[model samples]
Structures are given as C-alpha cells and as structure tokens.
Target chain A: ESADLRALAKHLYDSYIKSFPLTKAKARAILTGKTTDKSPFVIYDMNSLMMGEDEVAIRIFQGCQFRSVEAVQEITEYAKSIPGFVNLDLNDQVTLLKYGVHEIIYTMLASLMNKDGVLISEGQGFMTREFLKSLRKPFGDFMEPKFEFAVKFNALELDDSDLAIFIAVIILSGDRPGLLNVKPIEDIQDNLLQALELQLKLNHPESSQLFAKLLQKMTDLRQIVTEHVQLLQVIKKTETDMSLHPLLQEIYK
Target chain B: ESADLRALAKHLYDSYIKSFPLTKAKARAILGKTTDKSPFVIYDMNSLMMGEDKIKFKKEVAIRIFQGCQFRSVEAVQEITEYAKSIPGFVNLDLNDQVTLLKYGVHEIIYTMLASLMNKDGVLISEGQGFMTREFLKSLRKPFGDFMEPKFEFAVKFNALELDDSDLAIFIAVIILSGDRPGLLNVKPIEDIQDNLLQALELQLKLNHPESSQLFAKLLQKMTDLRQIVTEHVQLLQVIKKTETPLLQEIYKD
Candidate 1:
C-alpha cells in the first residue's frame, strides 16, 4: 500500500477491525481479489537481471579495448585542440606524439579500471587473481602493474573535467629530446596546471591534498609507461616474427 | 696505453677487449676493481634546513643540490665528449651533429648514471652521509624536493636491473652515439657509430652474463626508461622555473 493511502486505510481499519475483527478471509472478501491484476507490483525475473549485468559487462569490456586503440586517434586530435600544441613544428609535433602517446593511452586505461584492480570484461572478466598470472610474460608484466597503480589512483575519483585538463598537461609536456622551443610549451603546461589546481580545489572539498595526489599520479603514469616500453622491447627481441606498427617502431627507435 | 699514442689504441681497446679471449677473466677484473659512487652528492637537508631562517636554508640547499647536479652534469658532458672523441669516425662527422648528439643525449646518460646510486630503499645522495628516503623527497615543497621524486622512482627500479660497471660503460656509450636524437645534421654517421657500440655491448653482455639476451634486452629497455625519466625531469623544470633559481637555469641550459 502507498504510505498516504495506507494512512487512510489504517484509520478505517482501526475503526472497523475493532468492531468486526477483520480476518484474512474478511479482508480478501472485501477486496474481492480485484487487486490481483495490478501493474506496478509485478515481480521481476531474477535470472534476467543477472543476465543483464553480464551483457553490460561484456559490452563495457569490448568498449574498453576498442577505445584503447581509438584513444590513440582521439589523443592525436585532442592534441590539436590545445592552442599551443598545434602551433609547434610538424616534426616536433610528431616527436611529442611518438614519445607521449603511450603515456596518454595508459593514463586513460588506469581511469577505466577505477579503484579496484579487477576489470569487468566480456562476461564476468575480473582481471585479477590467477587470470592475470596465467597470462604469458611481457603481456602479463605490461598489465599487472598498470592495474596496481590504477586501483590506487582511482581512489581519488577525478571527474572528466579534471581528467581533461590533466591529460592536456601530459600531452603538452616540453621534455621530448628534440623540442625546438620549450618555453612556449612550458607556458601552456603552467596554464593547464593552474587551471587544474583550481578545478580540483572546488570539486574535491573533502580533501585538501587532492592536487598533490594528482601530481604524484603523474609520476606513477611515467612508471607505468616505462614498463609498457620495456614490454615492447622484450616482445620485439624474443618474438622475432611479430610485425610491429610502423608508428610504434618509429617512436621506440 | 700512453695518453698520446693509445688514444687511438684505447679507443680500439675499449671497443675490442669486450670480445677478446679474456671475456670472463678481464670483465671480472674490470668489475671487481671499481666502486660505484653517485656523482651528484646531496648534503643532509634536515641539518641544512634547521636554522631560524627557513627560507634562506631552503634556498641554499636547493642551490647546492642544483649546483652539485650541475657540476656532475658538466663532468658527464666532458666524460662523454672525450668518449665520443675516441670513437673511430665520431670526430669525422660535422661538428654541429656532434654538438646536437651531446646536447640531446647528455641528461639521459646522467640519469642512467644516477641509477648506480640507488638501492631498493632510496638513493645514496651524499656517498657515506645519507640515503635520502623516498618519503623525505616526496614530502618536499613545490618544485624543490618534488623534482627528485621522478628520478628517485626511476632509479630504484633501474637499480633492480643490477647492471655492473662494464655494462653501464657500454650502455653510456650507446646513449651518447644514438642517431635518433633530434637535429642531427648527418644521421647515418651517428647511426654507424651506435651500431659499433651496440655490437660491442651485445658481445660483452653475452660473454659476461649467463642470460645474455635478457640482459641486453634490459639494457635496451633502460635507454627508453632513461628517456621517460628525463621527460619527467623536464616537466619538473617547467614547474620549478617560476621559482627561478639562476643556477638551475644554467643546468637547464646545459
């Protein structure tokens, strides 16, 4: 019964049940089973609910790996969106892309994993426990540490706005070996950092240390990206027959 | 091995002895003789920061670490320039290419060398004085101690590779001769030089370590890792620049 309706019914029941002692039989007779065909009270099938979660998990996992590739394309386009990045020399732009793309890709991956190392992929695919360990070397090594860092990093719970500015900081970095002009790039990064600091302060009132934590996460991103490159190196050497993407070869070279 | 005559012979010997008959014996002799010391020695910041003038102490300490790193960085440029001068055809390349290679690659070499000072716990900043704790470094104020965090993070893991001095000397050579550095006037000559050094390094690792393939892979991996660490270092410099210490500016110019 709706609480409001129940209140009126309670008034009636309190008055009448005292007079007639309304038993289940009397109650059913009075209601006449007219309520049997109600719409909102229908019970849901539990099996279908379980199956729906599985379907969503599969779709999410599929989306994740697909987006990892798409992120490369997205980051290329996204780099152009930043004002100063587009102005850099074409070769310098390529050099930054070559060195920085992997870092950006993995940063997104960490965000997708959220606070737990276990990933939901393709029908209850928790990417922890034995499933990860059983993965072959290089691939396993590449993934495990990322999951480790992701779990810790996700605890901060940065929203998409914070993430957008943070990713900008990573892409606009002036540290590539052959940067022709660093000062302009440095100026852009400072602007991004200051903007991000303001956003974090307003959004994350629960913790004053949110900004510091985010910066440390950048260092962790560097660590993860280094491991990613190491795995690439290992695969190239031991797996001689494998064909690498030309862009990756150029980047790693 | 006379300085005047064996400059040529020393070059040949440095490149040659790795593949010579004394592979194990000579590699062992070379490894046994030397001690690995961090060239960038940091004084104890706790003691240095204790005076009533907190801001002045920090400024002094920051300048001191900056200058220490700068001093060692210059020495590295000298050391690597001499080594590059020793390479058979390195001097034959255009002077501009030589300068470009050194300019781009020196920090990579410096950071790689910095790895030798690290252990699982922390880096030995002042030789016998103190191993600067990772916690202490991360606790530092904006852009001051914070700059060391990325390097420390990299050094700890890199030290796990356990590359001995011989492996490192060859690795440093590989970093110096890399043809991929941006702005090279003639890439082919530098590429050729790197190839010679790579061959020497690969052979030396094979003779020196039981699992040579893995060791060589690890060393190659370190080159990429060095680049990433320097990348972080450059980012830190951008943040630190607003604070503007002149000594740090010179180090960046290096």
Candidate 2:
C-alpha cells in the first residue's frame, strides 16, 4: 500500500520550493494586495506607454523580458535537485536545459496568472493580454501566446504542491533533442510521472480525468513554446538589430 | 579500373580485422574442464559468478554479469567504437549523432561480429576460448531466454552468408553509419556517407560472393531483420541491467 505515496510527493514539493524558491502562494500574496518584506506597490498601476513616453515603456518591457530569462536560472536549479539530473552526461544535461527552459518558464507563469493575464517581477508588474498586444510587433507578439497559455493553464487550478512535480516532469523530459542517455533520463521521468499521477489522484479525487488532462497540457505547452522560440529566431534573423543577452543567445540559438 | 576505389574496402578491412591483442589464441588454449564449485547460486550470498556455478534460472542471470563476461562485453564496445571511427566519413557527422548511431547500432554490430566466433550450437567467448552453448544461454529464462535463441538463430543464418573480412567490414560499416537514426541534426552528410558505403558494400559483395546472384539482396533483407533484433535487445537490456557503464550506456541505452 505504501508507494510512499505521500512521502515521495512531499519530497517533490520540498525540493521544488527549496530550489525554485518561490511558489504559487506568492501570486496569491501579490494579487490579494499583500505587503512584501522587501517593497513595492503598483508596478505601473496603468500602462506607462500611455503617458506618451513610448520609448521608455517599450524599453522597460524589453528589460523586463531580460529579467524573465534571469528568473529561469531558478528553474534550472530546481532541475539539478530532481535526483539524477546532474549525473546525466554533461552534454545531455545541457541538451535538456536548452530545450526545457522556455517550457518551464511558461509553465511557471500559470502560478502568477489569473484569467486576465500574468503577474511579473514577483507581482511588481502585471502584463495584461491587451497591454502585451499593444507593444512592438513580434516582441508584442511574444506575451500573447504566453498569456493565453497561462489563462488556459490556470483553469487546471493547481496549487503550489501540484505545480512542483509537474514542473519536474517538464525539466527531466527524456525526449529532448540531442539527449544521448535517454534511458536513464526516461527512468527518472517515469518516477516523477508516477509521483505526479498520485498527487493528482490525492488532490483531485473527484476530478478523475485531471491527470490525463495535465499530460495533454504538456504537449500543448510545448506547441506554444515551439512557436515562441521560432518567433525568437525570427527576430535574430530579420533586419532588427537589438541583441539578446549572451545567456539568452545560447537558448535562442 | 586505374585506381579502384576499393580504397574504402581496403581501409575498412584494416580497421575491422586488423586490431588485435592475441587474446583469441590465448583463450583457445584453455577450453578444457578448468575447475568447478558452488551452491545456492540463485539465492546468492548477495554475490555470484566464478567458482564455476551452475546457472539454473533468472536468479543466476543477474550473477552472469560478474562472471567476467563483464569485461568482454566492454571490449566488444571499445573495438566497435574504434571500428566506427575508422569509417572514412563516419567521424565527420555531428558528435551527438555519432553516439545516437552507436547507441542503437552497437548490439547489431556486436552480434554481426560474434558470427566470426560461433558454431550453430554455441558461441565462442573470452576471445574464442570459452564456448557457451546456446542451450545454456536459453536456460537463463525469459527476456534473456527469449532473447538469445532468436539472436543465435540470426547469427547462424547470417554466418551462412559466408562473408570474408572485406565483405563483412563494409557490412558492419553500413550498420553503424545510417541516415535514419532518431534526433540527427545533420542528416544529409550521414545519409550520403551511408549511400557511399552501400555502393562500396555492393562492390565488395560482388567480388566476394560472385556466384551467388541474390547475395546483396539477402544482406539488405538482413538489415531489416537486424533492426527488429536491435529493438528487442534494447527492450530486454533495460529489464536485465540497471547499472551504468557510461560507455555501455552510450551503446545500449535507448
């Protein structure tokens, strides 16, 4: 009877919080007008681009986009704690991270999102669907898909605990391109998948289809991220000349 | 006819058959009774292999690893790698793709090479010194049991083709450098090279098996059969072993 069902699931949540270091509860804290230990009120309270300093608001959005890349390092850190991830061949680890980063980033947004849009910069800034649509051409095109994904994902109504193991599945995916040692990677993922399934059954006993529904969403998540990266590459190839940070360049390339 | 591009054939021969350490001759000297002892092998004292025990079932199959074929399985891989690198264009492909080809390709290559060391009833090991009977292998039980008989059958039939060093070298080269392996980022270069090797394989086969009109067609058919065997090998390999050789992982882990 002991799958160590609770113990393993608890390990997942503990490892996630220890490594990713933030939780959906932070979104609950931010959206409900909670105060912070560090500081901040209205990130803009309204669009700064509306104030006629178009360049400044657009510039701020670009910088915030870069900040999202920085936040993804925590996603990689959580993967390192997933037990057996680091022992993967070094190139295989890089291969998984290379394909996994954007997928994990978008999945993380479901935590900071509601039906309208996602909160960013630890809820210091909120980017609405309409606001994201109004920015520069393809840069503007970026967040709409992410916002749409978050809105669809929020419908799953996962708490921080469920999100923890789900994202572990995201990072340790065996099918990532260029992965050499797929069997070991698949074995680790099989354990996480089993753990993730149990969490769904324990937490959503009445919603029996939730586990399969969540598996389907992983494919759906990959589809949107594939488009996002294709759009990322378009900017790299086209006439525009703004440079991505070197770290972003590795993933984008 | 001036400079026969039998250069591919010539080079492949040196790469495939030339590497040697005289172990085959060494193993041949001691094929006798040796020595024997053991009890309760299946249950084990948490250890097994050597002391020449009788392997009755799956319990001992696990012990079969420590039986010293452990090192032999590894040598098979090292030599296959050295052989793979010798294919003129094989090394020019992307690095990860190289491992992916070897990962899926090595077992088929191993079995192909093992033909040189077999009789239909059993196969030679410890470099042609120790002959393990196919029935002894069949006793290891399902997965391994189900596993070896089909391979022994294929190997016996494959040996029936009666290929010499040149014909077999090109055949082994064709197996390792394939265009169809999954997740290859550089496909055309690999495909074209396999294309080139196939051309040379046909040339070598004609010279070696000229009286046999269907020889090339039969070898192509064996490639299909080899894929099925390799697939099942990976499926059984995961169930039989759970540890890593890093090098073994590169060849066997699918």
Fraction of true inter-chain Cα contacts (below 8 Å) kept per model? 0.00, 0.00
Looking at candidate 2, what is the lDDT of residue B38?
A: 15
> Candidate 2, B235: how far from true, in Å?
34
- The 0-to-1 C-alpha lDDT of every candidate, in the order given, reads 0.58, 0.67
Give candidate 1 regions above 4 Å deviation: A1-253, B1-60, B125-135, B245-252
Q: Provide backbone clash counts, one per model.
A: 0, 1
Q: Compute each candidate's TM-score over C-alphas.
A: 0.43, 0.47
Q: Which ten contiguous residues of candidate 1 chain B have the minimum total lDDT?
A: B49-58
Candidate 1, residues A1-253: lDDT per residue as tens digits? 2343334323323432332222223322222334432211111233432453443333333454464555566677767766678788887788788777778777666544533333333212333333444445544455677777766666777655566666766777766778888768766665665566566766687654466446546656777877777767776787676566554556678
Candidate 2, residues B125-197, lDDT tens digits: the string is 5444335666666665455466567778777667677776668788888788765567888977886777677
lDDT of 2: 0.67
Q: Model 2, DockQ value?
A: 0.01
Q: Give the per-residue Cα lDDT of candidate 2 at A227.
A: 79
**TM-score of chain A taken by itself, candidate 1:** 0.67
